[PDB]
């Protein structure tokens, strides 16, 4: 099984909320949302530039009713408290000229569209660190080797998108009740 482990050494609970913090303190803070481009509201998933900030608590769920999450299972990431305008708390990946980007949606999407992430163990580390993989849809299946990284746009928003270098390396801190 080899279940995902959180920042404090305890197994990650399937469906539990966690702050997705960068391994390296300097990289910034937690995950949030921001209104960018032509969006009518905060639909762009970004990383806070402030270290002291833990971002939004994020629910991490697989497609099973298991208590924990085996390392190779696909996961969906949703905000515990999504911005009012999103139809559901779940993140999804949307194509574009710039490339695939993590966004929220104004409509409820099918599971196959939100269960597109996968955490990957970062080797050479004492605390459990994980890269965040994006899993596209080949035929009817899926495949993940594209990593999610950060792209700072013209206004300083550190948008989460698929990048080819400097992928996110997170630790999952358990959010409080």
From Swiss-Prot:
Residue numbers marked as site, Reactive bond for chymotrypsin: 65-66
CDD domains: beta-trefoil_STI_WCI3-like
Keyword annotations: Disulfide bond, Protease inhibitor, Serine protease inhibitor, Signal
PROSITE patterns: SOYBEAN_KUNITZ
Cysteine disulfide partners in this protein: 41-85, 135-144
Taxonomic superkingdom: Eukaryota
Keyword Cell cycle belongs to the record: no
SMART domains (UniProt xref): STI
PANTHER family: KUNITZ TRYPSIN INHIBITOR 2, TRYPSIN INHIBITOR A
Protein name: Chymotrypsin inhibitor 3
Species per Swiss-Prot/TrEMBL record: Psophocarpus tetragonolobus (Winged bean)
């Amino acid at each position: 099984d080899d279940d995902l482990v959180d920042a404090e050494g305890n197994l990650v609970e399937n469906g539990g909320t966690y702050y997705l913090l960068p391994h390296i303190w300097a990289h910034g803070g937690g995950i949030e949302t921001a209104k960018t481009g032509n969006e009518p509201c905060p639909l762009t998933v970004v990383r806070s530039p402030n270290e002291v900030s833990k971002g939004e608590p994020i629910r991490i769920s697989s497609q099973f009713l298991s208590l924990f999450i085996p390392r190779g299972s696909l996961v969906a990431l949703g905000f515990a408290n999504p911005p009012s305008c999103a139809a559901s708390p779940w993140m999804t990946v949307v194509d574009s000229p710039q490339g695939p980007a993590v966004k929220l949606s104004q409509q409820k999407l099918p599971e196959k569209d939100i269960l597109v992430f996968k955490f990957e163990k970062v080797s050479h580390s004492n605390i459990h660190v994980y890269k965040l993989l994006y899993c596209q849809h080949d035929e009817e299946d899926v495949k993940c080797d594209q990593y999610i990284g950060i792209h700072r746009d013209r206004n300083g928003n550190r948008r989460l998108v698929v990048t080819e270098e400097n992928p996110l390396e997170l630790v999952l801190l358990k959010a409080k009740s």
